[PDB]
Structures are given as structure tokens and as C-alpha cells.
Amino acid sequence: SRANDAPIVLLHGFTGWGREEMFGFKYWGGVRGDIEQWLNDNGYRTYTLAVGPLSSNWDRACEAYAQLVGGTVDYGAAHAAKHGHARFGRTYPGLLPELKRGGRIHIIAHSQGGQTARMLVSLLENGSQEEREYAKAHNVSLSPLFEGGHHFVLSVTTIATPHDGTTLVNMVDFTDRFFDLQKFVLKAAAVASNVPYTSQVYDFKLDQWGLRRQPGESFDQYFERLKRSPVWTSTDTARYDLSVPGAEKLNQWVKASPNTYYLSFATERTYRGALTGNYYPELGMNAFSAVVCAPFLGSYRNATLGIDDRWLENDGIVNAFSMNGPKRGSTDRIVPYDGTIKKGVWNDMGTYNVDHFEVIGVDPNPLFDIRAFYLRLAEQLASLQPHHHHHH
């Protein structure tokens, strides 16, 4: 039964865009419809965040905070100075100014969005010691995000998240294939990549780096430029955080809050080869992943990196082993779901037979009842007790 009235906030991964972008084709629902609308129609207040798809989790978390409470994005003086980008970003009205008076939210995050959600909770609760020290030493102002003491996230649910990274980044042609993936998602929305649309269509939100698609430039041309830009070559990127080493680094500081419920959902769309031990793409897996990514994910081993046979099962984009919660470089605890959703730990909800993009509806799958999946989840989140009492 309903135990809380906290709104749900949706958060995309390394692909993703606002509700008005992509001519209205939703990241959350894709060819299946509009998940946010379904939830609202069923009585679960739901909102959508749109942050830089290729940006670092840190940048995205600062953007999410501002988008939630309102104001001008502040990446932190220390951070900005370390990485060489602007300290201030775009300005937002604030989706939920209610959070500045004591409200809470549930975040449902897909792909990288799960790393961002975790980091947002960590910064909200603990702030950043490095930013506080830098403000004290240099007399710069400090965003409240870095002070600590905010407890506005009741839960975080991750779906297909590379908590321990994805080996996809280890492909020798990853740079070219990753951008081909962005082209594939544009294709899902019936948008061409070789056309210089005057409309923005898909905004990468690279204000901090000073990058934007120019007049006369197609997505193909733009992506060529992004490949040689700091959002692709620096460590302050989705590229880095998505990697196994980068994810491990993030895990070393981004911990589970004792005050928050965590739910993890894994995805797989593969079968095992009996003679090779490799994993292969199932029929119905999105066409891009099936040809370009899945074969590699299902066969790449790297002993010194710790990539063993457990990593081969995948959803076309991320290794299933990486999805139940952070493990590499992490102190977080993961407990298999048994009917009781425990606080301050990852409740491993298991593995679902769907593809990285099918789970959000960007790729079709008539056998996956997407509406039921999200409604069931919404019901579960609404049942969470904001305060648990100890008992026998």
C-alpha cells in the first residue's frame, strides 16, 4: 500500500534528451510511448531530468541539482579549475522547489544515470571536502551542493547501470562505435545524422566546454568535432566514468547513503556458447548492439583488468555483472531481494531478459510489457516507508 507521496524523477544515461527534444520521441518510452505520462496518469507524480549525455557524472549531478531546486549550475571552483571548464553553466527554473522545504524524491535512472543518481545522493549528503577547502583557501563562493546536509532522495533505482563500468569502452574502435550509437538513437527517433538541421534536435548541453553544433553542421560533422574535444579526451567525461577503471574510481568515493533505499535491475539479452564459453546476442536485440557491440562484450576477457567469464553476459551495451551495484572499489553492500526492501544497501532485484534500449522502449520488444514493468516499480517505490522501525 501507499506509504509515501514522493514524486518520481527519471534520469537517462549516455544517450538522453528532454521531453521537447527529438521532435517529442521520448527517451523514457521511445517507440512504446511516454513512461512519464503513464505514471502521472496512474497517480504517480513523475518528472524528467535532462543532463549532458556525454558529460561526467559530476557535471551531470551538478546539473541535476540545479534542475531540481532551480538556479544556475555550479560545477565547483576546484573542479572547474582542475579540468579546465567553466564553473557556471546553464540556469534552470527548478522542477521541484518543494525540495528546499523538506520534500523527497525517488530517482529512476537508466544506464549511466545510475552512477549520476548515486553521486547526486553522495554530494547532497556529504558535500565535497575538496570544494569546501578550496572555497576557504581561495575565497570563492560555494554551492550548497558541496556543503552537505541535504537528504532529499528517498530512493534510487538503477536499470542497466554500469556500476563497475562496461568493457564496451575497451573496443579498439570504441570512439567511432560510440558515436555511431548516438547516430543509432537519432535513427530511432527518425532523425538523420547527415543533415544540418537548423532546429537543435538533440542538445548535448556542453555549455561548460563551450561546444555546440554550429549552423550548417550535421550530427556526423558535429560528432567528428566532439571526438577531438575535451568531452571525449579528458577524464572529466562519461567516457572515463563508463570505463572499468573510471567506474572503480567513482566507487571509491560514491557510497550508499544509510538514509536511502537502493534498487538495482539488471538486463541481459544473450545466450552462452557451449564450446567457447562466450555470450552471443539473442534474436530481437537492437540491430546496432547485435552487430557492433554484443560480440565483443560477450567474448572480451582481460585477466590483469579482472575481466573474467562472469563479465560476458550482457544487454548489448553493458556487462550484466556490472549492474547489481558497485563492487569494484566499493564498500557498498548488495543483498538479493527476498521480499523485503532494505535501506542503505543495494536491493538486487535480479535480471530481466530485455536489451539496453528495449528496457526504456527505444528499441521494440512486444514480449516485454513495459507499461507493467514501470507501474509495478512505481507501486513498489510508493510503498517504501520514509521511516523504518526496528522490530523482530
Q: Residue 284's binding partner, choosing from Zn ion, Ca ion, none, with beta-carbon cut-off 5 to 8 A by kind?
A: Ca ion
Q: Is 358 near Zn ion (CB under 5 A)?
A: no
Which of 179, 89, 106 shows the shortest CA–CA distance to 143?
89
Residue type present at position 166: T
DSSP alpha helices (H): ranges in the chain? 35-41, 57-69, 77-83, 113-126, 129-138, 174-188, 219-227, 230-233, 238-242, 244-251, 287-292, 294-297, 370-382
What is the smallest separation between the CB atom of 355 and Ca ion, expressed in angstroms?
Answer: 6
Q: Residue 236's binding partner, choosing from Ca ion, Zn ion, none, with beta-carbon cut-off 5 to 8 A by kind?
A: Zn ion
Q: Which three cell numbers stand for residue 292?
A: 557492433
Angle between the N-to-C axes of helices 57-69 and 113-126, in degrees from 0 to 180, rounded to the nearest 10: 70
Q: What are the CA-CA distances from residue 1 to residues 5, 276, 378, 384 (Å)?
A: 11, 48, 11, 9
Question: Judged by CB, which is closer to Zn ion: 54, or 266?
Answer: 54
Check whether 79 is labelled as a binding-site residue: yes
Check whether 236 is labelled as a binding-site residue: yes
Question: CB of 148 within 8 A of CB of 126?
Answer: yes
Question: Judged by CB, which is closer to Zn ion: 236, or 315?
Answer: 236
First CA to last CA across the chain, in angstroms? 21
Q: Is 7 near Ca ion (CB under 5 A)?
A: no
The window from 92-100, 132-140, 365-373, 384-392 that contacts Ca ion (CB under 5 A) reads 365-373
What is the smallest separation between the CB atom of 292 and Ca ion, expressed in angstroms?
Answer: 15
Binding test (CB under 5 A) with Ca ion, winner from 181, 363, 370, 378: 363
Beta bridge pairs of residue 221? none
The window from 211-219, 234-242, 263-271, 374-382 that contacts Zn ion (CB under 5 A) reads 234-242
Residue recorded with cell 550535421? 218
Does the annotation mark 143 as catalytic? Answer: no
Does the annotation mark 220 as catalytic? Answer: no
Question: Judged by CB, which is closer to Zn ion: 80, or 117?
Answer: 80
Q: Residue 315's binding partner, choosing from Zn ion, Ca ion, none, with beta-carbon cut-off 5 to 8 A by kind?
A: none
Q: Is 122 near Ca ion (CB under 5 A)?
A: no
Question: DSSP per residue over 306-365, as a string?
Answer: TB-GGG--BSSSSBGGGSSS--TT----EEE-SS---BSSEEEEEEES--TTGGGTSS--
Q: Is 284 near Ca ion (CB under 5 A)?
A: yes
Q: Is 30 near Ca ion (CB under 5 A)?
A: no
What is the smallest separation between the CB atom of 59 and Zn ion, expressed in angstroms?
Answer: 4
Question: CB of 12 within 8 A of CB of 26?
Answer: no
CA dihedral 348→351→357→361, nearest 10 degrees, is -90
Residue recorded with cell 538514509? 259
Residues 303-362 within binding reach of Ca ion (CB under 5 A): 358
The window from 23-31, 79-87, 149-157, 238-246 that contacts Zn ion (CB under 5 A) reads 79-87
Share of the chain residues as helix, strand and coil, in percent rounded to the nearest 5 = 35, 15, 50
Q: Which of 12, 74, 110, 111 is catalytic?
A: 111
CA quadruple 266, 272, 278, 282: dihedral sign: negative
Does the annotation mark 315 as catalytic? Answer: yes
The window from 33-41, 83-91, 289-297, 321-329 that contacts Zn ion (CB under 5 A) reads 83-91
Binding test (CB under 5 A) with Zn ion, winner from 21, 34, 36, 59: 59
Binding test (CB under 5 A) with Ca ion, winner from 320, 365, 377, 384: 365
Q: Is 131 near Zn ion (CB under 5 A)?
A: no
What is the smallest separation between the CB atom of 304 and Zn ion, expressed in angstroms?
Answer: 29
Summarize as ranges the residues that interact with Ca ion (CB under 5 A).
284, 358, 363, 365
* Catalytic residue positions, numbered: 111, 315, 356
Summarize as ranges the residues that interact with Zn ion (CB under 5 A).
56, 59, 83, 236
